[PDB]
Amino acid sequence: TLIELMIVVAIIGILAAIAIPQYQNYIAKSQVSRVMSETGSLKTVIETCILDGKTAANCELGWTNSNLLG
Amino acid sequence: STAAVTGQTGLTITYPASATESAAIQGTFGNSAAIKIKNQTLTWTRTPEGAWSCATTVEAKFKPAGCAS
Incomplete structure (x- = not known):
């Protein structure tokens, strides 16, 4: 019957109009936290170099490239 | 364990038999050492004047x- 198909169309329209949360916040926060951890890992080597009296060129960083450029 | 014969193969002692030669305590890494430094050595050398x-x-x-x- 026509009314059943119209109800199906209405249900499809209702489902398609679901509110989408701003998922950008979660991804951005996770990426910033990952960069936070990655950059804070270098604090140990930087502090040891500074307290050892080494120059900038003599401080060996164990840095590996990060895909976030952080 | 004596200077001539130590109890470990990774430790060697070079003892001066005269007044003009230097003493040495050499240790080669291995066993539980990292693979990167598996065969390197660290030495303490003493000059005939007594400087380490x-x-x-x-x-x-x-x-x-x-x-x-």
Whole structure:
């Protein structure tokens, strides 16, 4: 019957109009936290170099490239 | 364990038999050491005048400030 198909169309329209949360916040926060951890890992080597009296060129960083450029 | 015959194969003692030669305590890494430094050596050498110093054959980034020479 026509009314059943119209109800199906209405249900499809209702489902398609679901509110989408701003998922950008979660991804951005996770990426910033990952960069936070990655950059804070270098604090140990930087502090040891500074307290050892080494120059900038003599401080060996164990840095590996990060895909976030952080 | 004596200077002539130590109890470990990784430790060697070069003892001066005269007044003009230097003494040495050499240790080669291994066993539980990292694979990267598996066969390097660290030596403490003593000149005939009685001055001690340290040398190491590992890479510079692994050298402590004491044996940077």
